[PDB]
Amino acid sequence: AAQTNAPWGLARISSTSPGTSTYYYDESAGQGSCVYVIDTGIEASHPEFEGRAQMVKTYYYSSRDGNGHGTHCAGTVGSRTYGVVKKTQLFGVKVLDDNGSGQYSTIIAGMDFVASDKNNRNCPKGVVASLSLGGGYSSSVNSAAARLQSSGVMVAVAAGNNNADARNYSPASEPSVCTVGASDRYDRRSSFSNYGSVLDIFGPGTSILSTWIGGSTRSISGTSMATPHVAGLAAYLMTLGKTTAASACRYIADTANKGDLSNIPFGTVNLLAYNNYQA
Per-residue DSSP letters for 213-277? TTTEEEEE-SHHHHHHHHHHHHHHHHHTTS--TTTHHHHHHHHSEES--BSPPTTS--EE-----
Identify residues 166-185 at the interface with Cl ion (CB under 5 A): none
Measure the CA–CA gap between 221 and 191, rounded to whole angstroms.
Answer: 10
Query: Least Å distance between CB 41 and Cl ion?
Result: 9
Task: Please identify which of the residues 15, 33, 170, 224 carries the catalytic annotation.
Answer: 224
200 is in an annotated binding site: yes
Query: Least Å distance between CB 264 and Cl ion?
Result: 40
CA-angle at 169, arms to 166 and 170, nearest 5° = 120
One-letter amino acid for residue 216 of the chain? S
Query: Least Å distance between CB 57 and Cl ion?
Result: 5
Tell which one of 10, 37, 53, 55 touches Cl ion (CB under 5 A): 55
Q: Find the distance separating the first CA and the last CA of the chain, reported in whole Å.
A: 8
121 vs 185, which CB is nearer to Cl ion? 121
Tell which one of 63, 143, 219, 270 touches Cl ion (CB under 5 A): 63
Residue 56, judged by CB atoms within 10 A of its CB (0-12, 13-18, 19+), counts as middle
Task: Please identify which of the residues 69, 72, 79, 98 carries the catalytic annotation.
Answer: 69
106 binds Cl ion, rule: CB under 5 A: no
Identify whether 39 is a catalytic site residue: yes
Beta bridge partners of 57: 93
Q: Which stretch binds Cl ion (CB under 5 A): 47-55, 79-87, 183-191, 205-213?
A: 47-55
Q: Which stretch binds Cl ion (CB under 5 A): 44-52, 60-68, 110-118, 131-139?
A: 60-68
Determine the 3-state secondary structure of 238 from DSSP: helix
CA–centroid distance for 217 within its chain: 18
Identify whether 17 is a catalytic site residue: no
93 vs 115, which CB is nearer to Cl ion? 93
φ and ψ of 249, to 5 deg: -65, -50
10 binds Cl ion, rule: CB under 5 A: no
CA-angle at 132, arms to 127 and 134, nearest 5° = 115
Measure the CA–CA gap between 128 and 248, rounded to whole angstroms.
Answer: 10
Task: Please identify which of the residues 39, 65, 98, 184 carries the catalytic annotation.
Answer: 39
55 vs 95, which CB is nearer to Cl ion? 55
Beta bridge partners of 212: 216
Q: Give the residue numbers of the binding site for Ca(2+).
A: 16, 175, 177, 200, 260
User: Could you list the active site residues?
Assistant: 39, 69, 224
Residues within the interface to Cl ion (CB under 5 A): 55, 58, 63
